[PDB]
Design a protein around this nucleic acid. Structure first.
Length: 220
DNA sequence: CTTCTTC
């Protein structure tokens, strides 16, 4: 009856291995276990300088509203891009960019690379002023006017791209990226667009961070 | 996994 057969026994021949060792890693964590010595340093100086102004608990809920404010923003964009939200400062801030968005092909949709073996969750694949791109919407309290102000956002964007131009669940491909940074006070958002060549150069930088991850784990 | 925090 069975049509494809593999052997139960191996013709070649206190373990307590955890389940997650074999899970396909995610795009974000691959990046978080590959941060530079200076990047981990700069963020920790920020956490400890924070907790001193707000106490161990005040910061703990400062973290809660940042995450939630992000949450509601993405719930807002899914309602507006599924085929009072206009009083949100973040939506006030993206309203101009958002009128440039049509042809939505995916919202909050998971992506998997079979050969490169990582997963991710794309914000949205839509047309922005005609160019079909992977879009990453992001909240921020400080302005991020240049793309190098967004830190690792370029590399996750290109990580979502090249992984979804091979994910079998997508018939189409994409060759551009867009990071949109929305601010709480309502001032206009900063679009950071990434044409095909600039996604190519970050894609190179992302393949380096993927090798660091596979290295650090194999010994560990 | 995300949602963010470095500059």
């Amino acid at each position: 009856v069975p049509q494809n057969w593999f052997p139960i026994f191996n013709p070649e021949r206190p373990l307590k291995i955890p389940l997650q060792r074999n899970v396909i890693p995610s795009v974000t964590r691959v990046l978080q276990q590959t941060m530079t010595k200076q990047q981990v340093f700069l963020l920790e100086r920020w956490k400890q300088r924070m907790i001193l102004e707000l106490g161990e608990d005040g910061f703990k809920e400062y973290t809660s509203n940042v995450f939630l404010q992000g949450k509601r923003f993405h719930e807002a964009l899914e309602s507006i891009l599924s085929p009072n939200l206009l009083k949100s400062g973040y939506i006030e801030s993206v309203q101009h960019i958002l009128k440039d968005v049509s042809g939505v092909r995916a919202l909050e949709s998971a992506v998997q690379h079979e050969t490169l073996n990582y997963i991710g969750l794309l914000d949205c694949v839509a047309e922005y002023q005609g160019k079909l791109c992977v879009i990453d919407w992001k909240t921020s309290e400080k302005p991020k006017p240049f793309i190098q102000s967004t830190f690792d956002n370029p590399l996750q964007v290109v990580a979502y791209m090249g992984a979804m131009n091979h994910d079998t669940n997508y018939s189409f491909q994409v060759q551009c990226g867009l990071i949109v940074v929305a601010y709480k006070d309502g001032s206009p958002a900063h679009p950071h667009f990434m044409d095909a060549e600039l996604c190519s150069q970050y894609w190179t930088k992302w393949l380096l961070r993927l090798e660091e991850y596979t290295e650090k784990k194999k010994n560990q």
